[PDB]
Amino acid sequence: MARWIPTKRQKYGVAIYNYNASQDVELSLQIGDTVHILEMYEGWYRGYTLQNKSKKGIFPETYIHLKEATVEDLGQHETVIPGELPLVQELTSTLREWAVIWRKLYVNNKLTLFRQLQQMTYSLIEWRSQILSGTLPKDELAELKKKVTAKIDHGNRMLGLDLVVRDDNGNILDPDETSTIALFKAHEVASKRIEEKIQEEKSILQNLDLRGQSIFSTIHTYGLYVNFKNFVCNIGEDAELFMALYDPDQSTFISENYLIRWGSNGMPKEIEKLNNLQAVFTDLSSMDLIRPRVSLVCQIVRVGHMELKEGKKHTCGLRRPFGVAVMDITDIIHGKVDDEEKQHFIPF
């Protein structure tokens, strides 16, 4: 234990598994035991373990990962992307305080926020592990930066904790005490986010998860999916008319509504139709027609399918002789008359 030299290339002195206690200092070291080392040797780094920063621990290099990185990650170009890795270090600190959050949340039962906390912290670690790799496009990184700081200060909110500023480039360049009225306006922006988020979290999390399908009280348009179809066919013309009129009554943040339909005769799909694009809409009314050509003799059995499109499947619709509860009526009304346009009411 001689030739010990100061260094600063040891900020990430990282273990592997339970280290063994051949020396009196060490114990069964956990997975993530960073060591703020103060002395250097060829294959053995003894330095301040984070668990007890006043107790030395002597640790082999074959247990340490050589990590030249500092808390700053742009000096050595260590940022896999510039201006971000400050986020990962502050997220690790925020998890280090999530340590005591879980440690103390059991002595007493506030289990509702804790269940949604299990959900939200699973989500948080999910985003962190995604952003471990820099394969994401930069706009994904900006959005992830925003949402990570949102979760962090939302935790700081319900715990009665301090606040965070400079929602960009690592939450650093504003809190670096560079000015003061920029500081006051940033604090006002952040606490306005607090007020917005507290009112909205109260509103959704309490009323809008109960004001809905479970409670008979009046609500807005939600996941009771309602869409209207107008199917026509003429015997002589041997053509098929299809009105994707309008599909109102959509659910939460109904993304990029668009509609589809296939002309399917068997397992493979023969023909398809394309319709225009529009943005987020609760009540979207394209009312567009594309006509597939099928004759009466082949009209006895086909696959008339349609599906509202968001990015996640809202539902599926398949109107054909082997129908179910709410499309047999439209089947009978479409087959009874071959001339007029009949508007139908149907859930999926």
Next chain:
Amino acid sequence: SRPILELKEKIQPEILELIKQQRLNRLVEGTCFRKLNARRRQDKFWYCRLSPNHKVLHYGDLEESPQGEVPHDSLQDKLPVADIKAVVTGKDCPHMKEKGALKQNKEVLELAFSILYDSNCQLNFIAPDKHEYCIWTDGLNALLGKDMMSDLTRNDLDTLLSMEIKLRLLDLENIQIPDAPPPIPKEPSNYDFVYDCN
């Protein structure tokens, strides 16, 4: 995750101790308990509240309190646990083995736990359903310095310990975790600190 789970199962100390200390608090906070065989103008709600010193239980025959527990000195204020044998569970109840008029219902078989003491008398309690029955059996076996026997205990145990490992894998990510024990290359013999300590 074989070395990971081996680490997880190797380090018990903190996790189960603190669980039992929350369980002590659960016994302390108290609730409305249940008696035996109340049909002819007999009460059905009472309390057996632990001391904040976690040694003695205040209990006895109490009233119909819609709010819950009544803080005061009750009928039977002592339950000494320096000498308790055990708390039998299942069909080992000298009160559930009645053969005359105090026979117990079959559907309430999952409320069975008897704090046996004095080797001749019994204090026999009844729970509403399974979960908090297992909660008080957690408390009871925690009064013995032994293992826990609750469904809630296994659920919390797994989520907690998995989370703790999950909250430990932070500094290793992007890099694999070797399982083979890394060597111990030789060291200098002298304690000569070239760099000053502290």
Next chain:
Amino acid sequence: SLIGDIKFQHFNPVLETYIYKHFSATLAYVKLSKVLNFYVANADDSSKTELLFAALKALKYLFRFIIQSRVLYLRFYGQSKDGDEFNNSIRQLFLAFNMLMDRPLEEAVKIKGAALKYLPSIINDVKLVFDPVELSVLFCKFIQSIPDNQLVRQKLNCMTKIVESTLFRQSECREVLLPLLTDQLSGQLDDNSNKPDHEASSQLLSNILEVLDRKDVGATAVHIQLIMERLLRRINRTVIGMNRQSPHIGSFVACMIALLQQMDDSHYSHYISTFKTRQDIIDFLMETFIMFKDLIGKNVYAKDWMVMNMTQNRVFLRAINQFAEVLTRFFMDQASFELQLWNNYFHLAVAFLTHESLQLETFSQAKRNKIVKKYGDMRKEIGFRIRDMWYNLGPHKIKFIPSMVGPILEVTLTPEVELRKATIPIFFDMMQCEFNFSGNGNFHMFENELITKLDQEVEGGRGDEQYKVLLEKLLLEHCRKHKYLSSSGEVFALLVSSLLENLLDYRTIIMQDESKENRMSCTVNVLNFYKEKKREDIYIRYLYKLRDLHRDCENYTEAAYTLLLHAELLQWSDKPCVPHLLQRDSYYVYTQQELKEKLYQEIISYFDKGKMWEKAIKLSKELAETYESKVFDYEGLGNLLKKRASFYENIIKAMRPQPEYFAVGYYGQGFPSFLRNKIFIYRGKEYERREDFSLRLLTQFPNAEK
């Protein structure tokens, strides 16, 4: 509003400006548009030909000033210089501003007045050439609408949009523009019309300070000095006038903070400290200090904003440090006398130092490190400042010790080791001063308030064991350095140590045990402590504490017997000899007579309801005797003798139980210092069963054996 980018890219038409010619004599269009604006002054034709161009014609002139103007002046007018005529044409535009928008119009002056000072700021930014003529026409815009007393907060918005841009070519515009800014803010100071423009002036002061701060845009030191010298008194008087907490006071305190941070000592001390006669600068520093203290105590933010709160703390450090430099170099012995605004200064000092301590310093194990790296241990600097100040005030402390020992323990009590380590010896400073005043008295005047305040604070729950050891060490060491009066200080430090020991025992037991019996034993222990050490007023304070414990346990007999331990001290006389006998629950005159009258009435009531009538009689006799021989309140004798008759009737008539007496031997050593190996012969209760009592005394301790 809805397209957003591309047709909006046509809205700022780089397509039109760079694709097309734009090489015409559009200055004719400029003059004729001046005509359009002014000569068409009318009801409806004007109301459209003006109001439908918010800026858009001159918003195209925004790009014109280069692409049309300069290119026509270069390709075509490069040898036929014209670049100064438009100064004449647009200054006649300005003349028809002056006249028409001030003198003859008188209806749309509300609307046009709001709408034509809306224009120019929009269209003057890109016009950066001819920066002297900019200065001239801008001060002319200052001249034009010296308005009637309507604060429609629109001219201020024009000031905002003026100071926003064009301040990159700052060295010319800033100093020629600020005069009207400062004049109108000073008008906003007090004219019984602040309320419309509080928000406007907040927005203003904020944006002006933010743009001034900008590091590379333009040099600002001397202009910061003139901002200093013509606005600090007015903004501190703004928080005089906006002193209410309900308004957007936060924004103004923020502007105050930014202004106070940006200037330095070389900026501060020159002239705000060097104004007129001393009384009216004393009033200024009094205003400044008391409003720093009223902002710091009862803080203005939401106590969740650690960052800005600490920044406010640091800028207030700078402000108090500069305004303390001025105090040192102006109001010390250099000044004549009346140096008791240092009272306000130290009040603010301590009130500043009494938050951001180890609780929310340690809430995370790295919170201490965060705040001591970024902002440093602020408390350490505040304390070191206060200690050097207490070494500085020098010979004239004696005029200030008895009023100041109170708040200084609020810094000595601070947990952190170094701050304390530096802070203690000021007590020896006070005893040194009073030794120099020992010709008439001793340092008991310090010692008395030290004991009182130390008691209230320690019982409050601040000190600790390290605190007592360090206080003992430091105080003894300091009082080794001085004459025999400091040997007396040594023994009195021994007294202080014992007081700390007893109070910390009480302190741990009160909350560690929760057994009213142990509460009672320990509080009676400290009561006996004060009785032996003879500190009457605190003795009474804890005596009423004991009475509170009993009255909530309704040990009526014991509550009364204690209250009588109080009432014994008093006398039946007339003059209130000592004012210390007034409780904190109510405090006014009460000569001794009516005090014991209330005391004995309550004591009798307690003994009455507590079924101990022999004593209640024995005291009603003393009442009646003093009444009918000293005050002749014969209604008092009436109802009093009535009550005594009831007492005697009760003693004979009914019958009351006999308490059972046990005898408890708390044997062993694992017991505290006061219960160890001696028998407590508990009085019991009416029909207590030895099992019940030994059960309760099982509950009183761990290790319930027999």
